[PDB]
Design a protein around this ligand. Structure first.
Ligand code: GNP
Ligand code: MG
Length: 171
């Protein structure tokens, strides 16, 4: 034993869905109201999950990005992925298929640890129903979690659930 177990997590999804707001809530317990588009940013946090001390390396990605050899190179470092859409943006939900295919391509595998995240659950303008998201997640064999980066609903659960999926795959 040389130190804690390390887990490399990557947050993906369409522009504006709340990838950065979810990550900053986890790290800083702060809600970011401004929309500052991301290119690529990295964060770290030590936490305890199921009685195991873990070091989380979190990579926050761009939601507006053409094909990039450089995008593939950082995505291939990930061990697990949060696939994020916004519950008031039907196009972001339809884009989940594209993110899943991109991940399978870069990892060259059919069985990659992933969690489906439906964010902005605090807003009144829901267009994607809970049952539709749950059916999509069941079709992939992965968990679904509803979140709000503003209220903090589900934020810790999303990241911890992804770590649990990585552990099941390793073992
Ligand atoms: N009401 C509410 N607003 C949110 C929520 N999560 C994010 N937002 C808002 O949505 C906007 C975009 O959030 P942001 O985290 O920057 O999205 P992103 O997915 O990182 N965008 P990009 O891909 O361009 O980096 C911000 O104005 C933010 O305050 C939420 O759960 N509820
Ligand atoms: Mg961002």
């Amino acid at each position: 034993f040389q130190g804690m177990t390390e887990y490399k997590l990557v947050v993906v999804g369409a522009g504006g869905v709340g990838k950065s707001a979810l990550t900053i809530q986890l790290i800083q317990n702060h809600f970011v109201d401004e929309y500052d588009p991301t290119i690529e940013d990295s964060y770290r946090k030590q936490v305890v999950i199921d009685g195991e001390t873990c070091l989380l390396d979190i990579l926050d990605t761009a939601g507006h990005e053409e094909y990039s050899a450089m995008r593939d190179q950082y995505m291939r470092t990930g061990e697990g992925f949060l696939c994020v859409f916004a519950i008031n943006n039907t196009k972001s939900f339809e884009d989940i298929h594209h993110y899943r295919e991109q991940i399978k391509r870069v990892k060259d595998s059919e069985d990659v640890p992933m969690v489906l995240v439906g964010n902005k659950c605090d807003l009144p303008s829901r267009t994607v129903d809970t049952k539709q998201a749950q059916d999509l997640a069941r079709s992939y064999g992965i968990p679904f979690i509803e979140t709000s980066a503003k209220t903090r609903q589900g934020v810790d659960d999303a990241f911890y659930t992804l770590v649990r999926e990585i552990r099941k795959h390793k073992e």
